[PDB]
Design a protein around this ligand. Structure first.
Ligand SMILES: Nc1nc2c(ncn2[C@@H]2O[C@H](COP(=O)(O)OP(=O)(O)OP(=O)(O)O)[C@@H](O)[C@H]2O)c(=O)[nH]1
Ligand SMILES: Nc1ncnc2c1ncn2[C@@H]1O[C@H](COP(=O)(O)OP(=O)(O)CP(=O)(O)O)[C@@H](O)[C@H]1O
Ligand SMILES: Nc1nc2c(ncn2[C@@H]2O[C@H](COP(=O)(O)OP(=O)(O)O)[C@@H](O)[C@H]2O)c(=O)[nH]1
Ligand SMILES: COc1ccc(/C=C(\C)C(=O)c2cc(OC)c3c(c2)OCO3)cc1O
Ligand SMILES: [Ca+2]
Ligand SMILES: [Ca+2]
Ligand SMILES: [Ca+2]
Ligand SMILES: [Mg+2]
Ligand SMILES: [Mg+2]
Ligand SMILES: [Mg+2]
Lengths: 438, 348, 53, 425
């Protein structure tokens, strides 16, 4: 049951790079594609084969497509450490980018490159015997990441109607953002993509930035830092697809376990522990401590306050030295001290998965090796706070029609702005209906 | 130069706070919608907590605790006291109360009948979190009239036992209530303003007539409006702690601290410590402080009863200057330092 | 506090702990993109007319 | 991401020449076009402004235009004169007599096609043309009249490419002829319609900086142009060197211009120089936002910032830069429009300009720029109400109506700036 990864725009590509580097480290795959521990040469249907195909010469090749409308970012993949991992058809670049303009990525340029992308994706699909769907990595804020991604999602729904689609989306933050129009792009892409995505993991760059500042003691985090952290979270989420396990073994299960209502499909991710490599000796956090840390806003991928929302589903994904008894003990403890309210029509429970292999880190990196870690995926109404933030920024510019002429000049209509914003307003109201009392 | 914004033009307390901040010369007020602020003096309703703490390079403070409404709405206060392990359902300082929707109707009726058969006093009061300024309150010893009154309204009500044996000030044989101001800062320290106020009735207490709600309702507005003896005994029907302590000494051979304030400090502590895990901002991306107004009754046994908690209290005029200065000292400058405490810190 | 559906294997295990019971077609996409392209073409045509003047 | 550079008229070619000297120096290109630098950062985006010729030579993608040959003879005689492509000198013999009509309609019209042939030749060899940048003055005839005509023709041939200008505004304080307000107003009229981004380089501000700050009693065009070189280097840094932003002219336009007409930028620079003590980042930031460092004679405290782009150059704490910039906005939050969140963007480049350990360059889209157009407008009106000096223009075939139209458009522009200066919530 294969899984295809699609990385769109700079954020999607660089995070993709980080993730596949990490995947290779975790499965014992070298930069040249060889995998010594793999005794079946030229094929097999092991778990890691969900993400890697095999050549007759024993090369293990990522089931991935990289797409960017300019070439500078993907060129670094082409000439980088893991260049031998990929075939050139997997790496697609145009000559000029979307200029931070959703409409330019979706309409003007998207129309010219979408079929090429679909063809390359189809080539990967043909290899698959039982494809389950796609993992799509992109920023909210970029012209390509927003516009082209939304176009691509529409077309993927058309060409693979059965398949599941999962999103990993970088929500825009003023600290590391690029464009002043990123709220616009975010609302436009969320509106166009909402029907076509089964489960979306938002990562607020603000949260990652502060985690890097606070716990890694990095004064001014770079994209490399952010991406190594993010890749740790992504690996936690996809480990169940790549390894033997019983929890979340196919893309459909993410939808089944985390999303009771289709529009409300943005689970909050929380990760612990994030410990600095520079710290020579560490106090190893116990199951109780990392599980408790999962309910601290300072460890969330999106800053918000789950105490003032309601849960619809909670998932705990441990890696390393963890046994069920310890988890149940810790959960017992945490219930009595924490504000954890579920909606009345959902069971108050946790789905737990434990992978015995402790997390892997990039050598000479900023993250320390720890003996146990946990990523919590919880669908809480609290994440609507992020939408409220974004929509407000949108409302501020749109009231004056600031920058709108750049979008209209690309063939988009002004009406799409208000259509998208109305959809977001509906989304917020949905969150409030599910989560708020009188 | 710190910056702040004002989003509640109706708050007397924070009008004064704002004035003081400006007068320090180190605070600048911005237009209410400018996001680049250090301090938000927020609006009473739908305060956008979700937008706080996302401004790079700005430590941000707001004058409200998200979640504190649980204490400051009557229905939700009843529910909180009845369902919180830390506050016994049998907790002794809160008057037997029931939440009724225009629901604990049958429960209330059951207790009521139990009281009727046992010859006991059965005078209850109906009040709406909805109702305001003494409007929508009914005191009756018949359940039927209360429920009829509630059903004619549109929002949730509470039926709570009337305290038929209140402590009466002499002369005048008159009722009163106690207002305490409590400031909770960003570290969740609990500061009780040393100065409380007694809001008194200027009419003789009459248990044979609960329809005349003048000597039954302490409310300053109600006394100022309907009482023709308003201000006869004390100015603005407000007695302060120096005089009240002296009265307790002369009349009952006891002090305000021993007979009453121990109980009050206990109740304040219990309530705030109860919800601390739910509303604390110690690890949040923004920080909260808030001024509360606790309102108490004292019965003839010198027992203290919590009546209600107010999330946006006004102050007694003569006290505005001091308290407000205190707010700037411990709640604001503590976070944003400028270039003999009036508060009792309630430890925990 | 009930543990259910415990599954084990050499690489790990999983279980559930309960604490309390309780699309547009291709043609339409093509039309959207072509409508946008057309609006771009109209705007450019207006510009080239203006420049010709 | 190639840029085609065009310089027209006397002013345009003099500041254009200094620009090429300065950035050639920064990229380690000697006057013969040979590379002799020490850092690969110098070459990574060298293509944005330079073509490669045989023998690993680098030749500016620059077109030199004039209606008389004097200044271009001066360029060819100059220090880096040998570096320019000989075929890319396009000049007439007649001149334009400081007359917009001659540049735009009569003298210039004859020479325009030759320029376009050279433009076409340069564009067609571009991997992916980013757009065009034009240097010129607005107060003369060639740079103003022919320059605007060139921009109009280029838009026609390349409607989908960005047009960027460095436009030098006239000032009575540094004046060649009385008709400069006519030429500038006519010019501004064209620029509002046909450019995406215009840097307003005000000769009044240059003179004032030279006189008051640099303590030069009698400023020459050499001195003013030293300021202009520094400013042009700064505002093209992000285009010329590897960075986090992936900077180009289209992203600049998209992010700086909230409304199509309001694309006239106020440049600024720090430190102002003609000491061996490098500035501290707080000093850089303070001076950078100071009215006395603005290259347009406008007081930013008399308006509000729509958007801002900042470039810090040199080895400095990026943390400290962030702190200082955030500090400026928070302290002065009043002067930044609240209906554009996060309207200030900062970039950093490790390579400092020559002779400085560190510098800061400022690009503001501020409503205060209206003061410049107002100033021109007043000077225009004073003459036009009596039709003074008009025969120079009507003798070239123009009608008064064209003047009236241009005056109206500029006044509207001023009204639009005021309109957004007053917008709230
Ligand atoms: N976490 C993280 N965020 C990134 C990264 N690269 C870009 N971003 C964020 O993405 C947003 C900008 O979108 P980009 O991905 O750079 O733009 P794009 O998708 O290539 O689209 P274009 O406009 O054509 O360049 C900003 O919010 C950046 O902070 C990255 O490598 N890691
Ligand atoms: N259970 C009770 N027993 C006796 N008296 C009571 C009572 N409940 C309320 N009262 C009287 O009614 C007065 C006002 O009641 P309550 O405080 O609930 O109304 P309110 O909230 O509109 C005024 P505030 O907001 O100032 O407290 C009290 O000051 C007290 O005199
Ligand atoms: N800053 C600056 N301004 C100049 C320079 N040369 C001319 N000017 C100004 O440009 C205007 C005259 O235009 P000019 O370029 O000489 O005429 P043109 O050749 O027909 O374009 C006047 O406002 C002069 O002050 C220069 O080298 N630097
Ligand atoms: C106010 O918000 C912004 C304002 C400007 C920009 C600029 C971008 C993305 C550039 O590409 C850019 C930046 C620049 O300097 C910061 C440039 C430039 C282009 O041309 C030369 O100087 C990005 C923004 O988010
Ligand atoms: Ca195999
Ligand atoms: Ca679908
Ligand atoms: Ca020809
Ligand atoms: Mg990009
Ligand atoms: Mg009240
Ligand atoms: Mg001249």
């Amino acid at each position: 049951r294969e899984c295809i990864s699609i990385h769109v725009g700079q954020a999607g590509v660089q995070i993709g790079n980080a993730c596949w580097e990490l995947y290779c480290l975790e499965h014992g795959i070298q930069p040249d594609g060889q995998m010594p521990s793999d005794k079946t040469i030229g094929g097999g249907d092991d778990s890691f084969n969900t993400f890697f195909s095999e050549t007759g010469a024993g090369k293990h090749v990522p089931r991935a497509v990289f797409v960017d409308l300019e070439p500078t970012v993907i060129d670094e993949v082409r000439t980088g450490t893991y260049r031998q991992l990929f075939h050139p058809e997997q790496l697609i670049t145009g000559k000029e980018d979307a200029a931070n303009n959703y409409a330019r990525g979706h309409y003007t340029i998207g129309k010219e490159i979408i079929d090429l992308v679909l063809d390359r994706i189809r080539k990967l699909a043909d290899q698959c015997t039982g494809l389950q769907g796609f993992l799509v990595f992109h920023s909210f804020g970029g012209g390509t990441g927003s516009g082209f991604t939304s176009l691509l999602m529409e077309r993927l729904s058309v060409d693979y109607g059965k398949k599941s689609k999962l999103e990993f989306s970088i929500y825009p933050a003023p600290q590391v953002s690029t464009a002043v129009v990123e709220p616009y792009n975010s609302i436009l892409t969320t509106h166009t993509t909402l029907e076509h995505s089964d489960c979306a993991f938002m990562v607020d760059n603000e949260a990652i930035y502060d985690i890097c500042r606070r716990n890694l003691d990095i004064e001014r985090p770079t994209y490399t830092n952010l991406n190594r952290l993010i890749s740790q979270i992504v690996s936690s989420i996809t480990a169940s697809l790549r390894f033997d396990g019983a929890l979340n073994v196919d893309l459909t299960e993410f939808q089944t376990n985390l999303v009771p209502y289709p529009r409300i499909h943005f689970p909050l991710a929380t990760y612990a522990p994030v410990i600095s490599a520079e710290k020579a000796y560490h106090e190893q956090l116990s199951v109780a401590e990392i599980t408790n840390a999962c309910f601290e806003p300072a460890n969330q991928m999106v800053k918000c306050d789950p105490r003032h929302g309601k849960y619809m589903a909670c998932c705990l994904l441990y890696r390393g030295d963890v046994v069920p008894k310890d988890v149940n003990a810790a959960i017992a403890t945490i219930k009595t001290k924490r504000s954890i309210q579920f909606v009345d029509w959902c069971p108050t429970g946790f789905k737990v998965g434990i992978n015995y292999q402790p997390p892997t880190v990039v050598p000479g990196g900023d993250l320390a090796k720890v003996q146990r870690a946990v990523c919590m995926l919880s669908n809480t109404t609290a994440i609507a706070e992020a939408w409220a933030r974004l929509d407000h920024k949108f409302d501020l510019m749109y009231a004056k029609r600031a920058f709108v002429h750049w979008y209209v000049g690309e063939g988009m209509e002004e009406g799409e702005f208000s259509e998208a914003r109305e959809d977001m307003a509906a989304l917020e109201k949905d969150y409030e209906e599910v989560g708020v009392d009188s | 130069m710190y910056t702040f914004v004002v989003r509640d033009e109706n708050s007397s307390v924070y009008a004064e706070v704002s004035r003081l901040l400006l007068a320090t010369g180190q605070w600048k007020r911005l237009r209410k919608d400018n996001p680049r602020f250090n301090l938000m003096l927020g609006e009473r309703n739908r305060l956008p907590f979700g937008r706080l703490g996302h401004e790079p390079g700005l430590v941000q403070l707001v004058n409200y605790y998200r979640g504190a409404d649980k204490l400051c709405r009557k229905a939700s206060l009843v529910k909180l006291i009845k369902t919180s392990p830390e506050l016994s359902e049998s907790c002794t300082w809160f008057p037997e109360s029931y939440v009724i929707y225009p629901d604990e109707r049958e429960v209330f009726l059951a207790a009521y009948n139990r009281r009727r058969e046992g010859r006991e006093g059965n005078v209850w009061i109906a009040k709406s979190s909805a109702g305001a300024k003494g409007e929508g309150i009914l005191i009756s010893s018949e359940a039927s009239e209360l429920l009829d009154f509630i059903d004619e309204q549109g929002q949730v009500h509470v039926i709570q036992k009337y305290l038929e044996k209140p402590l009466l000030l002499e002369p005048g044989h008159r009722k009163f209530d106690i207002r305490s101001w409590v400031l909770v800062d960003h570290l969740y320290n609990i500061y009780l303003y040393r100065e409380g106020v007694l809001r008194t009735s200027s009419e003789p207490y009459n248990s044979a007539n609960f329809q005349d709600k003048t000597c039954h309702l302490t409310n300053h507005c109600i006394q100022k409006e309907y009482s023709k003896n308003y201000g006869r005994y004390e100015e603005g029907n407000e007695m302060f702690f120096e005089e009240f302590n002296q009265y307790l000494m002369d009349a009952l051979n006891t002090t305000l601290e021993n007979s009453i304030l121990l109980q009050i400090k206990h109740i304040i502590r219990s309530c705030l410590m109860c919800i601390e895990p739910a509303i604390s901002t110690k690890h949040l991306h923004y920080q909260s402080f808030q001024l509360f107004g606790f309102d108490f009754m004292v019965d003839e046994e010198l027992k203290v009863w919590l009546i209600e908690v107010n999330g946006a209290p006004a102050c007694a005029q003569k006290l505005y200057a001091e308290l407000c200065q205190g707010i700037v000292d411990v709640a604001i400058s503590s976070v944003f330092p400028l270039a003999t405490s009036i508060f009792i810190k309630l430890h925990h | 506090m009930e543990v259910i559906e415990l599954n084990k294997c050499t690489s790990g295990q999983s279980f559930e702990v309960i604490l309390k019971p309780p699309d547009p077609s291709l043609e339409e996409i093509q039309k959207k993109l072509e409508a946008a392209e057309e609006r771009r073409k109209y705007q450019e045509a207006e510009l080239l007319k203006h420049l010709a003047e | 991401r190639e840029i085609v550079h065009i310089q027209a008229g006397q002013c345009g070619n003099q500041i254009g020449a200094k620009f090429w000297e300065v950035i050639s120096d920064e990229h380690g290109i000697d006057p013969t076009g040979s590379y002799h630098g020490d850092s690969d950062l110098q070459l990574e985006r060298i293509n944005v402004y330079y073509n490669e010729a045989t023998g690993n030579k680098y030749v500016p993608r620059a077109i030199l235009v004039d209606l008389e040959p004097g200044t271009m003879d001066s360029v060819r005689s100059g220090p880096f004169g040998q570096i320019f492509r000989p075929d890319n000198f396009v000049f007439g013999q007649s001149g334009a007599g400081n007359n917009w009509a001659k540049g735009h309609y009569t003298e210039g019209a004859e020479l325009v096609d030759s320029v376009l042939d050279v433009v076409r030749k340069e564009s067609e060899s571009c991997d992916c043309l980013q757009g065009f940048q034009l240097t010129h003055s607005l107060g003369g005839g060639t740079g103003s009249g022919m320059g605007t005509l060139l921009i109009s023709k280029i838009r026609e041939e390349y409607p989908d490419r960005i047009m960027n200008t460095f436009s030098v505004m006239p000032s009575p304080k540094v004046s060649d002829t009385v008709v400069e307000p006519y030429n500038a107003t006519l010019s501004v009229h064209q620029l509002v319609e046909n450019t995406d981004e215009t840097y307003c380089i005000d000769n009044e501000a240059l003179y004032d900086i030279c006189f008051r700050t640099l303590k030069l009693t009698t400023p020459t065009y050499g001195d003013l142009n030293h300021l202009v070189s520094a400013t042009m280097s700064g505002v093209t840094t992000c285009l010329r060197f590897p960075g986090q932003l992936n900077a180009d002219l289209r992203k600049l336009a998209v992010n700086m211009v909230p409304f199509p007409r309001l694309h006239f930028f106020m440049p600024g620079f720090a430190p102002l120089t003609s000491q061996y003590r490098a500035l501290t980042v707080p000093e850089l930031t303070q001076q950078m936002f100071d009215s006395k460092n603005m290259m347009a004679a406008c007081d930013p405290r008399h308006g509000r910032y729509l958007t801002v782009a900042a470039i810090f150059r040199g080895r400095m704490s990026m943390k400290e830069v962030d702190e200082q910039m955030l500090n400026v906005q928070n302290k002065n939050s009043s002067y930044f429009v609240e209906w554009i969140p996060n309207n200030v963007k900062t970039a950093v480049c490790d390579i400092p300009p020559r002779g400085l350990k560190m510098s800061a360059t400022f690009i503001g889209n501020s409503t205060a720029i209206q003061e410049l157009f107002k100033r021109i407008s007043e000077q225009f009106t004073a003459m036009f109400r009596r039709k003074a000096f008009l025969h120079w223009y009507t003798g070239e075939g123009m009608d008064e109506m064209e003047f009236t139209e241009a005056e109206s458009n500029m006044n509207d522009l001023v009204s639009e700036y005021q309109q957004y200066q007053d917008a709230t919530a």
